[PDB]
Amino acid sequence: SIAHAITTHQVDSDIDWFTAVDDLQEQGSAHLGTQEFSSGVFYRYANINLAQLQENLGGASREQALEIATHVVHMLATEVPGAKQRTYAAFNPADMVMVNFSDMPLSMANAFEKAVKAKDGFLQPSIQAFNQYWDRVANGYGLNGAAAQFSLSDQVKQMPTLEQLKSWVRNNGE
Amino acid sequence: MSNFINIHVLISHSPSCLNRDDMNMQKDAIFGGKRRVRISSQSLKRAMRKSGYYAQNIGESSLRTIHLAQLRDVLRQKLGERFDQKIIDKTLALLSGKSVDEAEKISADAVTPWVVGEIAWFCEQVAKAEADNLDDKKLLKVLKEDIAAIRVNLQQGVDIALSGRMATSGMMTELGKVDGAMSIAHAITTHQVDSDIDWFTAVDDLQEQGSAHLGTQEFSSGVFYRYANINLAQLQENLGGASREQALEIATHVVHMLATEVPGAKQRTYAAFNPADMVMVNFSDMPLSMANAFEKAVKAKDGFLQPSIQAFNQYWDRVANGYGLNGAAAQFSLSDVDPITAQVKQMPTLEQLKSWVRNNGEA
Amino acid sequence: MSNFINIHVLISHSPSCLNRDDMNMQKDAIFGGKRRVRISSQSLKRAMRKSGYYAQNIGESSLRTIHLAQLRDVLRQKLGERFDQKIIDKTLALLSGKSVDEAEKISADAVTPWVVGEIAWFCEQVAKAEADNLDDKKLLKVLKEDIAAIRVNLQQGVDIALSGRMATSGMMTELGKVDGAMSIAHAITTHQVDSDIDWFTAVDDLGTQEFSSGVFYRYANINLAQLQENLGGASREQALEIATHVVHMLATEVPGAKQRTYAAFNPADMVMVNFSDMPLSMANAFEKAVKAKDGFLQPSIQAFNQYWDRVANGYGLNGAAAQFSLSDVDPITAQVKQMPTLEQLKSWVRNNGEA
Amino acid sequence: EIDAMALYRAWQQLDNGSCAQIRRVSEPDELRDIPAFYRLVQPFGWENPRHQQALLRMVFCLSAGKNVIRHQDKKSEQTTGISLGRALANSGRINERRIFQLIRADRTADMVQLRRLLTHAEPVLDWPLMARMLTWWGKRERQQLLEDFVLTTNKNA
Amino acid sequence: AWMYLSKVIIARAWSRDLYQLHQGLWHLFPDFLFHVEKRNTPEGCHVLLQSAQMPVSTAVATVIKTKQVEFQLQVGVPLYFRLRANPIKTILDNQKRLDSKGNIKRCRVPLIKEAEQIAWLQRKLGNAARVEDVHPISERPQYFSKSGKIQTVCFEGVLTINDAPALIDLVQQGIGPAKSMGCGLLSLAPL
């Protein structure tokens, strides 16, 4: 299951007003085109139903499934849609990735229901919001489950590098 | 071998107005909830394209237009010595999808990039075709078989091999689609900018000055982060199958231009002819921008430039160590700065960096 | 034979009543996070233009106006002995795109620069066309063929050849478009002008800064090829002569009554001229605002020199370069020929960077 | 109601200092922070609270410049003069998306954008009609602005 | 020779006009001198405040910090200074308007020449200190609503002390007209 990605904060988009210069036409006032754009801190969410993956692959072992899930962790953390990227190049890598084993799927979008107010950017407050809401949810709903978090900033096991997170996932969180 | 060349540039500009919109206001952008001044990618691309450095080191830029009549006359005057005039005219008509009379206003449906060399080659193929009483549709079928021999012509049109092309009609609609190899971002300042405003007049030497109404021009200064990358595989393909060496050559010329070329907008009156204070080039498997180093808008101490560069460096550490980037990296900087993680080869000069690129990041 | 000549100037003068906005405030600009005082390039340009140095060494300056009626009267009085009034009227009419009657008011679309020598030349072509049974249309057509012949007249309107001109109507739309040769920036101080002081903490503790003087960085460059073209094909020597007078004026002129703080003692505070293929400005030497020592001038020169060294070495600039500064600051390492006086620098420019 | 041509004539004859001082605002309510404003709009019923909002808008537009908005009387034939949208379209300087984003712009966002358009286009128009439009300024007057713009552009082509 | 200096802010609510700034200031005290350092921010209006009495923060007038000083100035030492004032000349109305007493009004007119303004400074300081370096920052006219207009100037520079107690007298009394509308406060600092 995979969610739409939504920004953790409000966005009013900007508008690029462009022209197309005719190299053979002696100047002149043209009318300009428009293109909406914006930056933003996005929250991505997906979950994988291991049992269903196994069934879907013909009865593959849990290990093949944790493998696939690992690849999904990687892709979800790094792959960015190709749209307008030759013109805008937002080739950014994730600044936080957390994986969490569980008996019932659960998203964390509600951490950003109260839209994240900027202070020194949107990123750090976004991460902070995430961490607090995870603490609340975990303590309130008693989530005894493997969890690990990777982050580029300074019961949830920290990972210095994405490869270590991936290995932790491949090894069923142990 | 790494497929992607990443180019990061930090360039500081004095008071200027390098790019504006339909109402004479500086282009901006919101990043990290703060206003940055912005220079669009198009503005950059075209500044590079029409630059002198390009003309000397790369070749002739393409010719972008919609006026097929003027283009026709140009083609006649520049190719008339190699082809008969209605060979030329028929080529233009086939490529454009429009009838080439000798009417003197003939418009394509949109502004399109025309590469003269490409047109020449097509002229050959069609001359060949009608020495052979060969049908237009059949010629299409033929030329479609070997597209590489068409792309080989883009060596006289590198800007298109870099930045792609799409047409909507004519044989180009199936022969002319180029997927650009270079991806470049809008340049944004690494810090917040509230722009200044110049209140101006124009004195009339023939009337008593008296009370006047003053114009206003937004302007500012700022430390811009330029980013671009090159897909070597794609560029090789777009050049008819050139070697990695020629690609690293063009890539190098792009590094130079991206570090030195500035849009010409308002330059006769604000003159911000500034050279870049930092240039880092990084080889990789997956392209990656460093814009996020400035998501937290850089705050100034002893200027914006020093803190910007240090920001860039620290983020580069974080990301490199985090995502495990073992790729060739080199950095050129006009300031002696806090040491970026040692796995990045320092270069005292720009040309040394460029030779490092030409040599695939081993020299 | 480099095509661009770059003029870098450090000039020391008052920071007040120079260039004000709509509200009695001196213009300024933020650079590197600090507020600098600014003189705007329009102001510089027009100050040079109307200066006496210009009048005595370049020539008469362009006549910029929007009032075609009054220009009509001027052209009649100044050319009336050389052409018939009707030819003048015809000519102004063809160039401006408006009808010249004897009405009281006739406005152009915008304030345009006019050279009276140019107008006279056009009068010649018009009268000649009249005697040659040419309609206005083929007149325009043939004039389009030799433009340099029109630009030759800009030797009596050098400010135009330097800073450019656009027209929106008349025959000038196709015969009058001039692309300026000289690019010039806004003067900005190398330092913060607001006193660098937190007055709260300061009252507990009860370099030295200047106030009645400030150090400005002026940049300009001249595109020689372009100047030659705009002047109707003149030689690189004539180019370099004009560029030299611009080095002088840029190094010395202050808008309004005011002048350099040390006008009576030295001729210039600091000047460096540098030939190159691509123009580049040195403003970034002051991104980090200069902090005072004995005033702001030599820390500014020190900054200028350090940055010149780092840029020149980094980007490989081996074009000709000369500098005049009678301050003993740490020297500028690169091959930069030092000049004992200003005039010697000016003669070094006059001689394409070898003398 | 509010006398329009009176306010216009007062604005045309205001002293340049007051004039420049008014132009400097960046939001209609900031006019309340300025004396010259009150002296200007008092003869035209600022003292009646019903008319206040309106005046704030009108002056704000006028604040674009002393001669940005050029009044021109309607021809005796025509029932109404040149409305704003027609004027803007006639300028040739305004892009449709500016108008579109204008009418979809929130109280307040709205007047600022309009003033930018006015300075940019320097329109010739029947001023009292503009004044009325500004007196009411609700969904349908905005939509009418877009109508006049689009329809004039299509007519003229 | 005591005082205290405090950095206060006034909410944009009460900070709309010059008079209301005055009021806002006295309402946080059950006389003084002040200097406007940032006029409208969104948060409001920053002000440096020199006073006899202690400010305590109110609903619209927020005290940020406060420390309390007295002056020890040694003659002969040079110092940096900053002073916003309104240099004027008092004349008979050329418009020949008349006063309630029945004869021609007097008018205060600003000095609009640089030299005259600096002269005014040195005069006003007199024997207390000599101005060694000054720049006379031109500012936009301020208006208020009776109703009227004052034209200030902001001197920043370097002086040398010639009579410590006199200069201190000056610093606490204020220098020039319009003391209640932002002018007058002379700030000193060590070179």
Sign of CA pseudo-dihedral B47, B49, B54, B55: negative
Look at residues D134, D113, D114 and name the one whose alpha carbon lies nearest to residue D53.
D134
Question: Which residues of chain B have a CB within 8 Å of the CB of D120?
Answer: 23-24
**Tokens standing for residue B55:** 């003309």
Domain final residue pick, E46, E71, E96: E71
Using the 8-state DSSP alphabet, how is residue A4 labeled? P
Number of domains in chain C: 1
Question: Which residues of chain D have a CB within 8 Å of the CB of B211?
Answer: 16
Q: Do B213 and D67 touch (CB under 8 A)?
A: yes
List the single residue in B23, B211, B213 with the smallest CB-CB distance to D116.
B23
| Chain B residue at shortest CA distance from A41 | B32
Q: Do D35 and E141 touch (CB under 8 A)?
A: no
Using the 8-state DSSP alphabet, how is residue B153 labeled? G
Residue E135: give the domain boundaries: 72-191
| Chain A residue at shortest CA distance from B182 | A86
The burial of E39, by beta-carbon neighbours within 10 Å (0-12 exposed, 13-18 middle, 19 or more buried), is given as: middle
Determine the angle formed by the axes of helices D109-121 and D84-91, rounding to 10 degrees: 50
Cα–Cα distance list, A4 to A53, A70, C217, E40 (Å): 21, 20, 53, 42
Look at residues C4, C6, C55 and name the one whose alpha carbon lies nearest to residue C236.
C4
Question: Which residues of chain D have a CB within 8 Å of the CB of A31?
Answer: 95
Domains by residue range for chain D, with CATH: 1-157 (1.10.520.40)
Task: Answer yes or no: do E54 and E94 share one domain.
Answer: no
Q: Is A86 on the interface with B (CB under 8 A)?
A: yes
Query: Which residues, 6+ apart, have CB-to-CB distance to B124 below 8 Å?
Result: none
CATH number, residue E135 = 3.30.70.1210
Q: Is B198 on the interface with C (CB under 8 A)?
A: yes
How many contacts (CB atoms, under 8 Å) link C and E? 75
Q: Is C35 on the interface with E (CB under 8 A)?
A: no
Distance (Å) from the alpha carbon of B267 to chain C's nearest alpha carbon: 7
Measure the CA–CA gap between D63 and B26, rounded to whole angstroms. 22
Q: Do C71 and B277 touch (CB under 8 A)?
A: no
Convert chain E into a string of H (helix), E (strand) and C (coil).
CEEEEEEEEECCCHHHCHHHHHHHHHCCCCCEEEEEEECCCCCCEEEEEEECCCCCCCCCEEEEEEEEEECCCCCCCEEEEEEEECCEEEEECCCCCECCCCCECEEEEECCCHHHHHHHHHHHHHHHEEEEEEEEEECCCEEECCCEEECCEEEEEEEEECCHHHHHHHHHHCCCCCHHHCCCCEEEEEC
Task: Answer yes or no: do E83 and E50 share one domain.
Answer: no
- Secondary structure class of B40 (helix, strand, coil): coil
Look at residues B271, E132, B14, B274 and name the one whose alpha carbon lies nearest to residue C189.
B14
**Tokens standing for residue D54:** 């309106």
Query: Which residues, 6+ apart, have CB-to-CB distance to C313 below 8 Å?
Result: B348, B349, C334
CATH number, residue E64 = 3.30.70.1200
Look at residues B1, B11, B3, B78 and name the one whose alpha carbon lies nearest to residue B222.
B11
| Chain A residue at shortest CA distance from B28 | A14
Look at residues C351, C290, C347 and name the one whose alpha carbon lies nearest to residue C32.
C290
- Secondary structure class of B56 (helix, strand, coil): helix
Using the 8-state DSSP alphabet, how is residue A111 labeled? G
Residue C15: give the domain boundaries: 1-355
Is the CB of residue B6 less than 8 Å from the CB of residue B284?
yes
Sign of CA pseudo-dihedral E122, E128, E133, E137: negative
Cα dihedral A151→A156→A162→A164 (10° resolution): 140
Task: Answer yes or no: do E66 and E108 share one domain.
Answer: no
Task: Answer yes or no: do E30 and E89 share one domain.
Answer: no
Measure the CA–CA gap between A95 and A162, rounded to whole angstroms. 10
Domain final residue pick, E71, E90, E119: E71
Helix and strand element counts for chain C (H, E): 14, 11
| Chain D residue at shortest CA distance from E146 | D35
Cα–Cα distance list, B63 to A27, A30, B116, B250, C196 (Å): 15, 18, 8, 19, 53
Q: Do B29 and A12 touch (CB under 8 A)?
A: no
Task: Answer yes or no: do E81 and E66 share one domain.
Answer: no
How many contacts (CB atoms, under 8 Å) link A and B? 121
Measure the CA–CA gap between A47 and C36, rounded to whole angstroms. 55
Tally Cβ neighbours within 10 Å of residue B254. 25
Cα–Cα distance list, C208 to C292, C297, C312, E111, E133 (Å): 6, 12, 31, 29, 11
Convert C207-267 into a string of H (helix), E (strand) and C (coil).
CECCCCCEEEEEEEEEEHHHHHHHCCCCCHHHHHHHHHHHHHHHHHCCCCCCCECCCCCCC
Measure the CA–CA gap between C25 and C16, rounded to whole angstroms. 9
Task: Answer yes or no: do E55 and E85 share one domain.
Answer: no
Task: Answer yes or no: do E189 and E96 share one domain.
Answer: yes
List the single residue in B31, B40, B183 with the smallest CB-CB distance to A39.
B31
Tally Cβ neighbours within 10 Å of residue B3. 18
Phi/psi of residue C58, nearest 5 degrees: -115, -50
Burial B125-137 (b: 16+ CB within 10 A, else e): bbbebeeeeeeee
Measure the CA–CA gap between C31 and C11, rounded to whole angstroms. 18
Look at residues C73, C79, C140, C124 and name the one whose alpha carbon lies nearest to residue C101.
C73
Is the CB of residue A16 less than 8 Å from the CB of residue B187?
no
Is the CB of residue C171 less than 8 Å from the CB of residue C266?
no
Q: Which residues pair with C28 in a beta bridge?
A: C37
Chain A touches chain E, with at least 3 Cβ pairs below 8 Å, answer no
Beta strands in chain B (DSSP E): 4-16, 28-31, 34-39, 63-67, 107-114, 182-184, 187-189, 196-200, 215-231, 278-284, 329-333, 345-347
Phi/psi of residue C192, nearest 5 degrees: -75, 135
- Secondary structure class of A159 (helix, strand, coil): strand
Is the CB of residue A161 less than 8 Å from the CB of residue A150?
yes
**Tokens standing for residue C32:** 């590197």
Cα–Cα distance list, C342 to C224, C245, C325, E35 (Å): 22, 12, 9, 46
In chain D, what is the straight-line distance between the N-terminal and C-terminal CA atoms, in Å?
38
Q: Which chains touch C (3 or more CB pairs under 8 A)?
A: B, D, E
Number of domains in chain E: 2
Task: Answer yes or no: do E133 and E175 share one domain.
Answer: yes
Determine the angle formed by the axes of helices D109-121 and D52-62, rounding to 10 degrees: 30
Is the CB of residue D133 less than 8 Å from the CB of residue D83?
yes
Secondary element (H or E) of residue A33 = strand A33-37
Q: Is B208 on the interface with C (CB under 8 A)?
A: no
Look at residues A59, A68, A145, A158 and name the one whose alpha carbon lies nearest to residue A105.
A145
Measure the CA–CA gap between B17 and B270, rounded to whole angstroms. 7
In chain E, what is the straight-line distance between the N-terminal and C-terminal CA atoms, in Å?
22
Domain final residue pick, E53, E71, E89: E71
Q: Do A86 and B46 touch (CB under 8 A)?
A: no
Is the CB of residue C13 less than 8 Å from the CB of residue C252?
no
List the single residue in B14, B196, B334 with the smallest CB-CB distance to C185.
B14
Tally Cβ neighbours within 10 Å of residue D41. 23
The residue type found at D73 is: D
Is the CB of residue B181 less than 8 Å from the CB of residue B162?
yes
Task: Answer yes or no: do E156 and E182 share one domain.
Answer: yes
Measure the CA–CA gap between E136 and E110, rounded to whole angstroms. 14
**Tokens standing for residue E145:** 């609503």
The burial of C201, by beta-carbon neighbours within 10 Å (0-12 exposed, 13-18 middle, 19 or more buried), is given as: exposed
Measure the CA–CA gap between B327 and B357, rounded to whole angstroms. 13
Is the CB of residue C252 less than 8 Å from the CB of residue C260?
yes
Task: Answer yes or no: do E66 and E77 share one domain.
Answer: no
Task: Answer yes or no: do E89 and E67 share one domain.
Answer: no
Question: Which residues of chain A have a CB within 8 Å of the CB of D92?
Answer: 29
Task: Answer yes or no: do E82 and E157 share one domain.
Answer: yes
| Chain C residue at shortest CA distance from E68 | C204
Q: What is the CA radius of gyration of chain D?
A: 15
Q: Which chains touch D (3 or more CB pairs under 8 A)?
A: A, B, C, E
| Chain B residue at shortest CA distance from C182 | B268
Measure the CA–CA gap between A156 and C239, rounded to whole angstroms. 73
Q: Which chains touch B (3 or more CB pairs under 8 A)?
A: A, C, D
Tally Cβ neighbours within 10 Å of residue B45. 18
Interface-testing mutation among B30, B31, B192, B234, with chain A (most A C-beta atoms within 10 A): B30
Distance (Å) from the alpha carbon of C81 to chain E's nearest alpha carbon: 47
Q: Is A19 on the interface with D (CB under 8 A)?
A: no
Query: Which residues, 6+ apart, have CB-to-CB distance to B313 below 8 Å?
Result: B337, B338, B340, B341
The HSE-up count of residue E79 (CA atoms within 13 Å, CB side) is 26
